[PDB]
């Protein structure tokens, strides 16, 4: 039976799903861990105990408990990122799309969703794996992991709330794929992990973490890298935020045990309602409960691991979007609105700079301002708007990724870098937001192939070449088919630093992605902030 | 009669000189101070005592004692700035060119030479006042002042070597003009002082100093301003350099009196031979003996005077050249040569910014480097060279002047700002040096009007335009003649300036505003913080 699969934890029964006038098999909502509920809240995950009978894997699972965005009620542009299933702490499930007929031993791709480590679901429409699995003949897995305080409350020293347990959730799903994907026609020796934003940082963190390295072959990182300023905190700061969470909930704070015991008695929504109150500053692109540099999942500082070559040496493919910052300014900074051009006054520019670089002293804010201000034309609201957009995306996404790219390439086995800069013809968000954080995902997952969604024919072709780059890289470590007639995406090298644009035009090769601003963010500003 | 003038100090006899197929009167080498020689070395100047008989004013005077540039022997481009008369400590003289026939009561312009406060002569070819006096019908005076240690050795608290005596030489010549120019056909109520480089800084210093302000009407500043980083030192640093000069010469250092007595025994060239040894850093565009912020000539810090409005409120006309830095790199920085395009390696670029900003810490040098480096093309030797050129000129001339112009305009009565960016067609220096520090002077003084010097016809028209702007401003406080395109007032809000070149005038705003925010606001804050 094509839909009946016996795994090491028991039998599962999938469902036959239509795709683009054909069909493939889907195994939805397979458990990979014990429910992390009750006295297991904040604890490392435990493997799912084997079950008798047949697991009905015909429907999507629950989503993990998380903040729900109600900024634009009814608006598809925001609501499509919210949970579309019931939320529950019982949420550690994965989904598998398998070509039909079942392949013998084919390439596997495992998707890790983003969402700032505080939101995200495996079940969103834009993460539907059926188009990529069918078009490129890959076995596509999407995992899940605890987000927010449930996944990343860190009281270092405690074994009840150690921190990083959402990362351990991801690892346990990777271990399940390693142990079971052969029963679905996948090769556990050819697993590519890919993810976007926090999922892209996560992918980088598994490259670094010794306990993860042997559970995958190579990696794709989209608009995120492990060294991003929002993607981790120190053990001291994670302790600070966890204690502040208890303080917001009238918890006994005398010891880790009773603080944890207090927090385990609260309903999930009680923690979520105060989650944002524990941040140290008014800020944008900052999130309360994130991975912690603990000495276990990460043996030393990320920078020292990067400098020494202490990471998995393989092939990577990674990149960024042109306007990573716009969504964060819309939600968090003065003068921005989705129903206007959002021309930014000089006063609102100054406010946004402080929100964008909250850890900076006054000298550091001056440096950022001078670097991004045209003093011949300082009251230009369009230049002010775009300058802030660039500040947010450069500081938080692009320049951290370029730092990772350059350190990794010194030891890795092949780097391919992209710059996604296509604005979708059917975008529901205003034109000033440009090429938004997250809006390459629908191209990676082949949604433009669905004629009902009203993408252009050029956008379908773009989606198809991106899916084929991604999958060919997954299968071989090279996005290019050698001996093909197509334009070749060149290796990124330390010396020449090449990358391509991804858009609907013929390929352009460039060098030194945003090198000028990234010298500022990666070398000058940190030296300034460390001055005294 | 026309050439025989009785002044308050005695009779002077000038000479009839040819100018452009005509003639005017020249009175050369008139003394305005007692010779500051012997025990008067380093002291404030004293008025020249009256003489009987007729002072022969037919010949240029001696030049003050100074370092002589021998980098390019026989090269006219460097030797034209060196002394062209015998050097002597007996050098406090001035020169006057008077239209013929003698006007009744006309506008006076007084030239103050530059040269880093360590060199300069009133007698150079490019300062010949006859073309400007004749063409614009003004009385043209050039003064002189002691340079180097002789003018600016500063041992504050001593009255024997107090500092700033070179500035007091300038003021005494202005006092002499105030008292006597009426006998030469000049109006002492309509005196414009103007100078370039250190002379431009000097002009600004006389605007600030209460003891100078009543001795002139208006001012012109060319490629220099009083707040320039090279233009003054603190009394502590001045004292340190004076003590180090004595140390270099095996002087007794126990007391001011003993040090000064030692330094007064040395021959002039003995002091000049060690002058540069007292600088605290390897550097370019830094000079050993310069004005001191003493509490007397300058009542408080320059910045506080500028902020409070404690200065002379009048009209000013001022500006800069496109490539102020190139001359200093040629003489002082690795990789530059007069005989090549001087493409600058990355290594020599780093050495250059260190020499250019000697007071900066490592973080400050990084900031300057980031501000001027194209990291898409960092091994471009042309971009590295031009970046270093901009650094030197922006830091040392352009941005200090813009800080001055913005502060002055808040209280003053009229500001006119120019940007001189014409490369002379007969320039003797290589192309990479561009529009060099000092090379607007020949246009201000009308040398393009001289056929044998082989300027183009367009360059003669430019010089005539510049001479008329300068003199009309001197006469009225406004460079424009009330009838025709206008040079607009620089205002705090609109910040307009004009280019000066052979092309029709264009108005711009915010001269090098991006780099001057860096030099005037961010870098000072960075260095004060780190
Ligand atoms: C600043 O401090 C505080 C902050 C808050 C509240 N902040 C906020 O909600 C910011 C926010 C976060 N998301 C997450 C929604 N999904 C996503 C995306 C998810 C994953 C990956 C890419 C995504 N790309 C999106 C692009 C657009 Cl265009 C819209 C939504 C996107 N939506 N908005 C409350 C209180 C505070 O004190
Ligand atoms: C910090 O200490 C140091 C500082 C420096 C940096 N100062 C120096 O270059 C000064 C200098 C002066 N002359 C001889 C002066 N004639 C002049 C000028 C005179 C007055 C006004 C403008 C002049 N425009 C000239 C242009 C050219 Cl092209 C050639 C000579 C010019 N030659 N050099 C170098 C080394 C150091 O150690
Ligand atoms: C599995 O669940 C699906 C979805 O409701 C249902 O249609 C199907 O009958 C179930 N299979 C069983 C009960 O064997
Ligand atoms: C990857 O490693 C193999 C094995 O040593 C080597 O032959 C190849 O050159 C490497 N490729 C890159 C791009 O480093
Ligand atoms: C897609 O375009 C069709 C044809 O114009 C239109 O009827 C439909 O409403 C569009 N669908 C969406 C989801 O925009
Ligand atoms: C003034 O000096 C010049 C040369 O030094 C001389 O020719 C002239 O006759 C002198 N005038 C006198 C001595 O009256
Ligand atoms: C100069 O001062 C006069 C007299 O007070 C005044 O009328 C005029 O506005 C001033 N001009 C400028 C440019 O400030
Ligand atoms: C000026 O031009 C004349 C005439 O062509 C020429 O003889 C002379 O050499 C030139 N002078 C200089 C100083 O170049
Ligand atoms: Cl479909
Ligand atoms: Cl390489
Ligand atoms: Cl002549
Ligand atoms: Cl040039
Ligand atoms: Cl004004």
Author numbering:
A (entry chain B): 4 to 535
B (entry chain A): 4 to 487, 490 to 535
Excerpt from the paper describing this PDB structure:
Diagnostic testing and symptomatic treatment of myasthenia gravis are based on restoration of cholinergic transmission at the neuromuscular junction by means of peripherally-acting inhibitors of acetylcholinesterase (AChE), the enzyme responsible for the hydrolysis of the neurotransmitter acetylcholine at the synapse.
In the crystal structure of TcAChE complexed with the 6-chlorotacrine-based triazole derivative 16, the 6-chlorotacrine moiety binds as previously observed, with the conjugated system π-stacked to Trp84, and the Cl atom fitting into the hydrophobic groove comprising Phe330, Tyr334, Trp432, Met437, and Ile439. Along the linker, the triazole ring is engaged in two perpendicular π-stacking interactions with Tyr334 and Phe300, and in H-bonds with Tyr121 and Asp72. From this point onwards, the observed conformations of the phenolic moiety of 16 differ in the two TcAChE monomers of the asymmetric unit. In monomer A, the phenolic moiety makes a π-stacking interaction with Trp279 in the PAS. In monomer B, the ether oxygen of the phenolic moiety H-bonds to the main carbonyl of Arg289.
